[model samples]
Target: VNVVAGGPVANYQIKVLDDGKIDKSATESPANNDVQLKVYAVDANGNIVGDITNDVTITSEATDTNGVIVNASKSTANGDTVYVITDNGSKKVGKETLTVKLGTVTLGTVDVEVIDTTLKATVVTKKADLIELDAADNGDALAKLLANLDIKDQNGNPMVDSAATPNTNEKLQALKSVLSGIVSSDTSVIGSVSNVDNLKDDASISGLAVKKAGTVTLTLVFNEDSKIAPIAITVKAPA
Candidate 1:
């Protein structure tokens, strides 16, 4: 038997002869050979339409003596497919597909919650009292007035500040300072010295005399002026 040692091969040669026979026997084939593929969009019946042809080619190179054959296959629906084929010695083909689809899509939804707050005004009654001008001066007089005026509690106890003592001039001055805090109106005598005659006429014209003579009743009025509907708290005691 004779062996073909050396020969020139075409760039892309068909191994089988015209009558389908191997060209030479005992010949080493080239490795790294490849097949190229061209694709076209087909209808459901497998007929090409429009300008939807996709041309892609692959090449093979010879590195070692090993016979190589390349084949082609396809899935004709939507989307892409990539394929790779190789012999023991070399790569033969690399295939890919790009497809298109037509359909409708629906978007997703989300839910949210919101809160609303309201503000309100609340009026509260805190304190109430009935103060007598001479409560600190004459305790026996105050007790007599409470008894004669029937100013007694439901338990019949006399409502009088018998234990109350007179405040000193300094204490009266301090009390006058505190009482002067009522500045919303011009009627309070403790606030200003407008009546110089009233201040100088009497021998006892200072804060001590004023505290001894003056009377004030504090009531729990809810958002009202003193000249308006002043609150009416019951006079429970003479202090």
Candidate 2:
């Protein structure tokens, strides 16, 4: 008996579209409920050609912590635009990644965020602007950087609010120092960065006097607002 081995994929292309994440915490909507991903072939090297022109089987996956199952509904249009989404959050929040597979072979992965119903965060200095600060910053630099942010919550509400107590001010100020700990002119990936949203974990660098160099986004979790998942700021090294 003889078997033929498979070669590299001829062409790999998948289009995943999400105008924005689905905020299930807020009231659900038909438009935002589902993200659209188009699955089709190009004129050139068509993708996932298994056996005699096989079709790629698509599926969804979620974060280990949040077992929110992802559902990829086929589009009746039966062309491009496959619908991947939720019915009504059976009340679960998490992140999910969809995949295109040909039998055992994997073709592509699509990342989709499933945040609790809430408003997306915006910045002050520049809404969602890229922030590059000195890795050498101790506290002042970090605070100053945050000052420009003038942080706002999900609801477009001022975090400081028209009414804030001195103690409340002091508590938030302390975070400036803790965030500074994340600074390190030393670029190290082993102990430095993460793709997950663990930047603000109580047991994370923000909770300890640790540091790292290199490009990393410090995700500041706004605990008070369930709607505001996080406000991330990158602490980059000087060029």
Candidate 3:
């Protein structure tokens, strides 16, 4: 019997895929995010194959549950076919899953998690007392809160401190540089800062839910190797 050239497209496998987590906020209506998934062909022996040209398509199973959508077009990249997954917006606030199919043969699924982008203020200054400025009860709150904060490293060593040997105005400015640029991980959390005083004086200043006061994940992102970590700032008006 002549050996068949290649086993009939026995199965399909996910060559490269992402963990599939997307963060969205209630204010950011029509949250626009795209996920890329790759699929490849394999034989009965579970060995990788080629020429996966078949009726491959992706579908969002729990569309209503998660409010996600899978594009009809095959968005492949690098090696095999890729799927561009997206969602209309965060209807509620939870996780959603989408399915991938190759001519009715189930390949796998891509998980999607929707994180509420609710941000809070981490008002920092030379002294920890500045943290109290975020409260409305203090008139100088905003003004002092806008002042530069005490920058520190993972070990909590003051990068800029008045009571230190290595302390210098330039070093303080360097610490200020770290907070120069801040981007919120999610829209639910406010991270808009106005550097009128050349520092991270204000955080989570403006958001639809600012005064509402709620707990949300706030990821402080800095492309300049900033030491800020993900912290939960309570969005509330302090009495």
Candidate 4:
């Protein structure tokens, strides 16, 4: 007998479009309900073991099943075996978990959120435009200006993660801090944004200092398509 290295599947890797997530409106006209997942079979030593669709099985479970319709289809689209997550529609919004398994052995799982497409971020700051550049308001002071913020859908529903439907925290955190890139209209008065690309989780503002006494407007960039109200801050001489 000849010795050949290749046997049982060690693990399965799944990749999705748009950070492994897709946002869909409850009453979308065209009904955007297709999330493509690139599946890869890895061996014990991490080797591509080709397609194994025949030996794989996928299923999904939603947090709210009152009127949720979700399913997974295994297909070899364009010569590449992939799994298409079909979110037909739902009466309510929630997160769905897709579990992939090879026979009795579980391969991996993917979390998908079916949220409102027309969503907006509302940011509330302690000070509107009366921020001073004083030693008291240094370091994390300006960052703390963001007193509160919330993400709401078109229908004005705050998206929150609950026990029945969790995992929205990841999306919420990203949108609140990282995704909401900030830029000062006048970098001359207020120093350039240091953490423009990498905002802190605590929503801290970096490289924001009082270089001169002037009014600078801070524009927030969320998801790009969505719009968030701008915040204007007036920097005054240290009191």
| Model 1: how far residue 74 lies from native, Å | 51
lDDT of each: 0.25, 0.46, 0.45, 0.56
Model 3, range 126-147, lDDT digits (tens) per residue?
4432133255533222233333
For candidate 1, give the lDDT.
Answer: 0.25
- Which regions of candidate 3 are displaced past 4 Å? 1-5, 22-34, 50-54, 66-73, 76-80, 91-94, 103-107, 114-141, 145-239
| lDDT-better candidate, 1 vs 2 | 2
For every model in order, what is the number of clashing pairs?
0, 5, 10, 0
> Local error of candidate 2 at 158, Å?
10
* lDDT for predicted candidate 3 compared with the true structure: 0.45
Poorest 10 consecutive residues by lDDT, candidate 2 = 201-210
Clashing pairs in 3: 76-82, 117-188, 117-189, 118-188, 118-189, 119-189, 119-190, 125-149, 146-201, 213-235
- What does candidate 4's lDDT look like per residue over 1-239, in tens digits? 12135766786777685444445655555566677776666678766665565457888754646455577887775565667776676655667787878788888888776665644444333235555444555633244334334445446666443445342342245345434456777777655454544443332343455676666665555544454555444444443
TM-score of 4: 0.40
Top lDDT hit = 4
Q: How accurate is candidate 4 locally (lDDT)?
A: 0.56
Model 2 clashing-pair count: 5
Candidate 4 residue pairs that clash: none
